[PDB]
Antibody
Framework: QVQLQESGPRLVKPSDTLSLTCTVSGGSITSDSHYWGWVRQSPGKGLEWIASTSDSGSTYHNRPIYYNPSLKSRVTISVATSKNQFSLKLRSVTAADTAMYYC?????????????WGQGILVTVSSASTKGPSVFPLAPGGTAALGCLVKDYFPEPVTVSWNSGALTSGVHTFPAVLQSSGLYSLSSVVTVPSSSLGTQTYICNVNHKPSNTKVDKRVEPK | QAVVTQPPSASGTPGQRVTISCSGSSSNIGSNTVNWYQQLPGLAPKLLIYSSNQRPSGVPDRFSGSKSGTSASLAISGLQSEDEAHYYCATWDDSLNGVIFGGGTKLTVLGQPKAAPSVTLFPPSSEELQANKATLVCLISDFYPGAVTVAWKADSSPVKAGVETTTPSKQSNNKYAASSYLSLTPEQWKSHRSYSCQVTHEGSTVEKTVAPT
């Protein structure tokens, strides 16, 4: 019953080093029954296991370090037992390295069952520079529809919440269009009704983690 | 030869029973157990089956696994529209000393009913204007199958310039969603009187339209 979260720079340059971190938020990162690992998935493609390391392996068993051969030259795996974290460095990234990267908790038995998964982090390999978005308020029978427009960002993704996570009923966040300009746009829409509109305040909360950009925006019409 | 393989497709009608092969060799499936993972759109893989036949605590009873020789099989009894997903097999290979995956299988569940696109449209904002751009956004949701066209019109003057239309993507409920973006210039907006975003599907069309005023 372990929670796994990934963090690290979303946007690596060609032949730079990619380096992510896994934050284990549910138990203690030491167990002689589990290894800790990394899996990736290029967009539209299949799953590819990268490497997994053991902790701990002191007097009892060992500290076996397993790698997918195609990437062993390029890869480093690390634990920070003290901080409840493990890590992955991917050296010399190409565009064939753009992928959702996953933390997995692996099982020392049964061919390496990957039994707990983090939600995943999309790392894009590109020479383009980050661009945080711009948000514009979208103002509106029985049901009224209300929204935010997250305009021109790079790279994927941007998440959008409403009223700091309080409002999740009736929220629809649409997948992004890839414009001709190489930048992205998407929109998030709340279908509510009335009697409303006059009372509630409606803020959309747009995090674009690749640019460290967080914007709140209140709707209403002019 | 140190690699595993599965069919790239399977299909079925609710209530059915479908089976997905996974084929390897001596150094992997032959000498090792098998795991199976399900992956719904916009999500992460889940442990579905482990040690060839065991179940994790949440996995419904109709999911079961087998191994024999150099082949394994995932079997889903009582197909549900929930189950429409990609299904991967994984094992361990003694020759490469690590985890390998199959190429996955897309499981389509069909016989599910047509769904007509609900459509929402939006004018630009008294903010993207007094910055000096303009975008009309057109949001099309909850329609099966994922197959639409989007015509824009200036009065009927079908406008085609500056139109970005996403491809449809697979919503959670296994219906579909897409959006269209008509870009134009600030005065290009208060010049005409009204623009219309129309969305056909199957052979039945849908139109909403907005103005400045």
């Amino acid at each position: 019953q372990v929670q796994l979260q990934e963090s690290g720079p979303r946007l690596v340059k060609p032949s730079d080093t990619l380096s992510l971190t896994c934050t284990v938020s549910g138990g203690s990162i030491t167990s002689d029954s589990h290894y800790w690992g990394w899996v990736r998935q290029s967009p539209g493609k299949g799953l590819e296991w990268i490497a997994s390391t053991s902790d701990s392996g002191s007097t009892y068993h060992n500290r076996p370090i397993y790698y997918n051969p195609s990437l062993k030259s390029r890869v480093t795996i690390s634990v920070a037992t003290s901080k409840n974290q493990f890590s992955l460095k991917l050296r010399s990234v190409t565009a064939a390295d753009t992928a959702m990267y996953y933390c997995v908790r692996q099982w020392r038995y049964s061919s390496g069952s990957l039994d707990c998964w983090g939600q995943g982090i999309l790392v894009t390999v590109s020479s383009a520079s980050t661009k945080g978005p711009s948000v514009f308020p979208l103002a509106p029978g029985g049901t009224a529809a209300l929204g935010c427009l997250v305009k021109d960002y790079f790279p994927e993704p941007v998440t959008v919440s409403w009223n700091s996570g309080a409002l999740t009923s009736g929220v629809h966040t649409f997948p992004a269009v890839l414009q001709s300009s190489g930048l992205y746009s998407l929109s998030s829409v709340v279908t509510v009704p009335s009697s409303s509109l006059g009372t509630q305040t409606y803020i959309c909360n747009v995090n674009h983690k690749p640019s460290n950009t967080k914007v709140d925006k209140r709707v209403e019409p002019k | 030869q140190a690699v595993v393989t599965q069919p790239p497709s399977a299909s079925g009608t609710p209530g059915q029973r479908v089976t997905i092969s996974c084929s390897g060799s001596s150094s992997n499936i032959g000498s090792n157990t098998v795991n199976w993972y399900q992956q719904l759109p916009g999500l992460a893989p889940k442990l579905l089956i482990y040690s060839s036949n065991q179940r994790p605590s949440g996995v419904p009873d109709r999911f079961s696994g087998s191994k024999s020789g150099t082949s394994a099989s995932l079997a889903i009894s009582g197909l549900q529209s929930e189950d429409e997903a990609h299904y991967y097999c994984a094992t361990w290979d003694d020759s490469l000393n690590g985890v390998i995956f199959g190429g996955g299988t897309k499981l389509t569940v069909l016989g599910q009913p047509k769904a007509a696109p609900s459509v929402t449209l939006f004018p630009p904002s008294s903010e993207e204007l007094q910055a000096n751009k303009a975008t009309l956004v057109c949001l099309i949701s909850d329609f099966y199958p994922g197959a639409v066209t989007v015509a824009w019109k200036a009065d009927s003057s079908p406008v085609k310039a500056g139109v970005e239309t996403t491809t449809p993507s697979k919503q959670s409920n296994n219906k579909y969603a897409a959006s269209s973006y008509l870009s134009l210039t600030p005065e290009q907006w208060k010049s005409h009187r009204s623009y219309s975003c129309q969305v056909t599907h199957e052979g039945s069309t849908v139109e909403k339209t907005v103005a400045p005023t």
